Design a protein around this ligand. Structure first.
Ligand SMILES: *NCCc1c[nH]c2ccc(O)cc12
Lengths: 7, 304
């Protein structure tokens, strides 16, 4: 999810 | 003139990082989504916990309100969106079609369509009533970080880790514009301005930019925060002074003067990255939400 998500 | 946002309420209940906070268009409610797979509803003015909406199988990255404040749509790592009747808590529809995590979602202003963006590098447009996919746009060459409809619903803006913002004709699915500045950092957030003239785009080089999309020109840069890692929301604050609002990886909320680009306030209190902020539609109220070491939502109020 957004809360751990990196590029 | 500067705002004076002061902390009023701290909202606890999510068991993991909060991903997104959004105020209902009618000003009554705050919705939060979390990595804990839950949506929570809170009173916008007092932060009073209202109820929990459950059903996703994995963490949720985004939630959005319908125009009439009656429905939510959520975007989940379970590769679905869900449409929720807030009053009954019922899942009305599960939108299946993305092949990877759904990251971002929004209703059109007429709330008959949903737009979604995914780690599968596509943008999908969905019929709210049937819960069926109307269009699949091969939008990007990397995960889609944000999707938003413009003021009349005729355009979609998307952003991607591929470094591009794109503008799409809702009706035809055609790419009408590609926007990129003199570098190619991942674009972590985009939305249209309330007047529909501008897009506000975040890039993972600690920069927010205000674009005239029709002219394809960068008008304003907002700097001074930290954003190199996470897909942090940004907002137009329009109830008092005209501000830009964003979370930051230094655990602060940043507020800028939209016209002058100067920082007018930094809000201290969170114990982890501020991933999401939202601005109340009628009162000078900001909601902020923070990552795993914090797990709280805060409500801040200003005289202007
Ligand atoms: N946020 C997870 C890491 C990442 C970055 N870019 C991606 C593309 C596809 C995928 O499944 C994960 C991922």
């Amino acid at each position: 999810a957004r809360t751990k998500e990196t590029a | 003139v500067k705002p004076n946002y002061a902390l009023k309420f701290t909202l606890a209940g999510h068991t993991k990082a909060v991903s997104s906070v959004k105020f209902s268009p009618n000003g009554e409610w705050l919705a939060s989504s979390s990595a804990d797979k839950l949506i929570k509803i809170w009173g916008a003015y007092d932060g009073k916990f209202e109820k929990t909406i459950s059903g996703h199988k994995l963490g949720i990255s985004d939630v959005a309100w319908s125009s009439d404040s009656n429905l939510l749509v959520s975007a989940s790592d379970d590769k679905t969106l869900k449409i929720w009747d807030v009053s009954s808590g019922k899942c009305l529809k599960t939108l299946k079609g993305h092949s990877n995590y759904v990251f971002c979602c929004n209703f059109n202003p007429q709330s008959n369509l949903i737009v979604s963006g995914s780690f599968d590098e596509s943008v999908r447009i969905w019929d709210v009533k049937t819960g069926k996919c109307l269009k699949t746009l091969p939008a990007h060459s990397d995960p889609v970080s944000a999707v938003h409809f413009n003021r009349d619903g005729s355009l979609i803006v998307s952003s991607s880790y591929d470094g591009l913002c794109r503008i799409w004709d809702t009706a035809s699915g055609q790419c009408l514009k590609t926007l990129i500045d003199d570098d190619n950092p991942p674009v972590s957030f985009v939305k249209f301005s309330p007047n529909g003239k501008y897009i506000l785009a975040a890039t993972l080089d600690n920069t927010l930019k205000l674009w005239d999309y029709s002219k394809g020109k960068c008008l304003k840069t907002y700097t001074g925060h930290k954003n190199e890692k996470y897909c942090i929301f940004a907002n137009f604050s329009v109830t008092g002074g005209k501000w830009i609002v964003s979370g930051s990886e230094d655990n602060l909320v940043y507020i800028w003067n939209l016209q002058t680009k100067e920082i007018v306030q930094k809000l201290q209190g969170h114990t982890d990255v501020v991933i999401s902020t939202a601005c109340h539609p009628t009162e000078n109220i900001i909601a902020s939400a923070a990552l795993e070491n914090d797990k709280t939502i805060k409500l801040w109020k200003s005289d202007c």
